[PDB]
Amino acid sequence: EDVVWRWSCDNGKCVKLKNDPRSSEPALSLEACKMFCNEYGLLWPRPTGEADLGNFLSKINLNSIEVKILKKGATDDLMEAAAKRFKEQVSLAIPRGSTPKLTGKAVDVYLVNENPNEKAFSLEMDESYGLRVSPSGADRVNATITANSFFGMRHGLETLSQLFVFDDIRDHLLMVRDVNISDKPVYPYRGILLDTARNYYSIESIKRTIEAMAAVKLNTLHWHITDSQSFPFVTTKRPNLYKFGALSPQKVYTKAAIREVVRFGLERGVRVLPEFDAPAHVGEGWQDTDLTVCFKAEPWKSYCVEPPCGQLNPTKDELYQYLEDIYSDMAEVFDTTDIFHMGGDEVSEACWNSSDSIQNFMMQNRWDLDKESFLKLWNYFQQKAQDKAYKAFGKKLPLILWTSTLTNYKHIDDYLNKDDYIIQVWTTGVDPQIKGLLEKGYRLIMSNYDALYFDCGYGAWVGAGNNWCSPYIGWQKVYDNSPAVIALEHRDQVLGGEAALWSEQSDTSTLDGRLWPRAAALAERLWAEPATSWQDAEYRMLHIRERFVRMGIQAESLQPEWCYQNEGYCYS
Numbered sequence: 001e002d003v004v005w006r007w008s009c010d011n012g013k014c015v016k017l018k019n020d021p022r023s024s025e026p027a028l029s030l031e032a033c034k035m036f037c038n039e040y041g042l043l044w045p046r047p048t049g050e051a052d053l054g055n056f057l058s059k060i061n062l063n064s065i066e067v068k069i070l071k072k073g074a075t076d077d078l079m080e081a082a083a084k085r086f087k088e089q090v091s092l093a094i095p096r097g098s099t100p101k102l103t104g105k106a107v108d109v110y111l112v113n114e115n116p117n118e119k120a121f122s123l124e125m126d127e128s129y130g131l132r133v134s135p136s137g138a139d140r141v142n143a144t145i146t147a148n149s150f151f152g153m154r155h156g157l158e159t160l161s162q163l164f165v166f167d168d169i170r171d172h173l174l175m176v177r178d179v180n181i182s183d184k185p186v187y188p189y190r191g192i193l194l195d196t197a198r199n200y201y202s203i204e205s206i207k208r209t210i211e212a213m214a215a216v217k218l219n220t221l222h223w224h225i226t227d228s229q230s231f232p233f234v235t236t237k238r239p240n241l242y243k244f245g246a247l248s249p250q251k252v253y254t255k256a257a258i259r260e261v262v263r264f265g266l267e268r269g270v271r272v273l274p275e276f277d278a279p280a281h282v283g284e285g286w287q288d289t290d291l292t293v294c295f296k297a298e299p300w301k302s303y304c305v306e307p308p309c310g311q312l313n314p315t316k317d318e319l320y321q322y323l324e325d326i327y328s329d330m331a332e333v334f335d336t337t338d339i340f341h342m343g344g345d346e347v348s349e350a351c352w353n354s355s356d357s358i359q360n361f362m363m364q365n366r367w368d369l370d371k372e373s374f375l376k377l378w379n380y381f382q383q384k385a386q387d388k389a390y391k392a393f394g395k396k397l398p399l400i401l402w403t404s405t406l407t408n409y410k411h412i413d414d415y416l417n418k419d420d421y422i423i424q425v426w427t428t429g430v431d432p433q434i435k436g437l438l439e440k441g442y443r444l445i446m447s448n449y450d451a452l453y454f455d456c457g458y459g460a461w462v463g464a465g466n467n468w469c470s471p472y473i474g475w476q477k478v479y480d481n482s483p484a485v486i487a488l489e490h491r492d493q494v495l496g497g498e499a500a501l502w503s504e505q506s507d508t509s510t511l512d513g514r515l516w517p518r519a520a521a522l523a524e525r526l527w528a529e530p531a532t533s534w535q536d537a538e539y540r541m542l543h544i545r546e547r548f549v550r551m552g553i554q555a556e557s558l559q560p561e562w563c564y565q566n567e568g569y570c571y572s
């Protein structure tokens with residue numbers, strides 16, 4: 001049948017009213033009301049600069065949208081691909097099984113990339129853009145996106161597509177008539193960590209994830225591609241690692257597959273950043289090399305944080321030949337990344353100390369066998385691995401390490417320096433280490449576990465009860481978690497943040513629900529750093545969830561759809 005309700009704006013809320021026939025006032029459909037009732041309409045993330053959406057909608061012919069690239073250059077391929085995707089983006093405004101009447105104005109989209117040769121990812125990259133929409137002549141619309149680079153341009157196309165609304169009362173595709181928007185992200189690193197070693201993720205699901213990231217302007221996929229449970233990365237130089245280490249022959253990531261993902265990311269402004277976690281979090285794949293110790297050591301609680309145990313043996317020279325080859329194979333296919341993540345989480349002194357070969361090595365260089373001595377062994381390892389990584393990428397590039405015993409701010413400079421190492425933080429946002437590190441000049445990526453660990457909340461995977469970092473983190477808490485507040489005066493040293501999806505209890509099947517729409521909360525926090533709280537973003541968050549579902553993402557459900565249709569009635 002037909003929609004029988006209409007909506008009217010009342011104190012910032014769209015209230016549902018019967019669409020009575022005896023009225024001379026044109027009915028508003030739900031999302032048409034929302035577009036103007038809400039401070040930022042249906043935008044997500046909201047812009048950081050000018051956000052003028054005017055007051056009117058114009059009817060649009062879906063088949064009369066033309067994108068024109070005004071400046072050519074090295075990014076022609078990327079700009080043309082982005083332009084061709086625009087119609088599909090617009091169509092996301094239209095619910096499945098609905099069709100817009102093909103009437104209304106034609107839309108001219110003009111893309112102006114002021115530096116059409118720039119296509120490298122970097123922390124200094126320019127992601128800003130300007131967006132203007134105005135009527136052109138009597139029967140056309142002029143949308144002009146001006147940006148310093150392809151990446152800013154691509155963000156502009158994303159925002160522009162959000163300015164379309166489907167009127168399901170009249171079956172009209174509508175667009176905001178008068179728009180002036182200027183926009184740029186507060187932080188340059190806006191990421192999602194995907195662990196694909198604790199469980200395998202189909203490359204289809206990885207690309208889908210990238211699609212959703214780009215929809216909310218996240219720009220970094222951190223691919224935690226190995227761990228102790230499996231080695232799915234296909235290293236051509238050390239093929240036994242993936243042959244022995246993969247969960248199955250089909251559960252690998254070939255060079256061809258990785259190149260696909262990396263290119264897919266590039267087209268969508270997403271840096272694909274590989275991680276090789278070391279010297280802990282290794283195991284499967286390394287059998288018969290004699291380059292690990294404690295693999296599957298029992299009882300596991302005595303040797304590691306979670307089973308199976310396993311750590312590299314830094315005392316074996318051959319290890320660094322393996323490492324050099326792995327890093328080199330990674331550099332070959334992950335060839336858009338400007339940064340390399342080297343893990344460095346959770347090293348077990350007990351594990352290293354159960355090894356005879358290791359104990360001899362530490363005696364021979366006159367270190368003892370107490371906790372502080374193994375820090376020296378770890379330092380020895382990281383220095384040699386670091387040198388191999390530089391050689392693999394053919395240049396010095398920033399390296400990332402997790403917060404750990406090694407990166408304790410009190411002695412971190414004994415081991416590292418702030419120019420070469422970025423620290424990924426998974427402590428709570430009030431942990432003293434953060435202030436300590438910032439005072440030493442270190443740059444941080446925020447992944448604080450009390451707000452950014454998306455795996456928390458489910459059943460235990462060892463024994464019973466719930467998993468270690470329960471309770472489940474609602475989007476409200478993700479949204480309110482502010483790096484600016486965490487860092488204070490040292491804000492600029494924060495490169496951004498990253499939602500962590502560890503995969504002990506997640507795989508291809510759960511990935512859409514784990515990430516969405518919660519990662520959108522992080523997307524806005526990192527893009528805009530709003531002074532306002534989640535309550536002020538609530539209505540737009542409910543809409544972005546529906547947009548994800550329309551994209552084919554099996555996003556988590558936040559509230560009854562009744563609440564979405566009846567703003568203001570669901571509160572506490």
Ligand SMILES: Cc1nnc(CNCCN2C(=O)c3cccc4c(N(C)C)ccc(c34)C2=O)s1
Binds near residue numbers: 345346402502
């Ligand atoms: C980087 C990494 N991110 N996540 C990783 C998984 N290993 C997590 C280990 N772990 C736990 O298993 C764990 C269990 C029970 C309580 C706690 C805890 N509290 C609330 C006292 C603080 C930190 C951890 C923890 C903690 O770090 S490595």
Ligand SMILES: *[C@@H]1O[C@H](CO)[C@@H](O)[C@H](O)[C@H]1NC(C)=O
Binds near residue numbers: 143
């Ligand atoms: C389209 O609008 C832009 C944005 O203001 C304006 O600069 C440009 O000249 C217009 N182009 C046309 C064809 O009107």
Ligand SMILES: *[C@@H]1O[C@H](CO)[C@@H](O)[C@H](O)[C@H]1NC(C)=O
Binds near residue numbers: 370
């Ligand atoms: C390592 O083991 C030796 C005993 O073989 C012990 O003396 C030393 O205390 C241990 N070190 C640590 C940190 O456990």
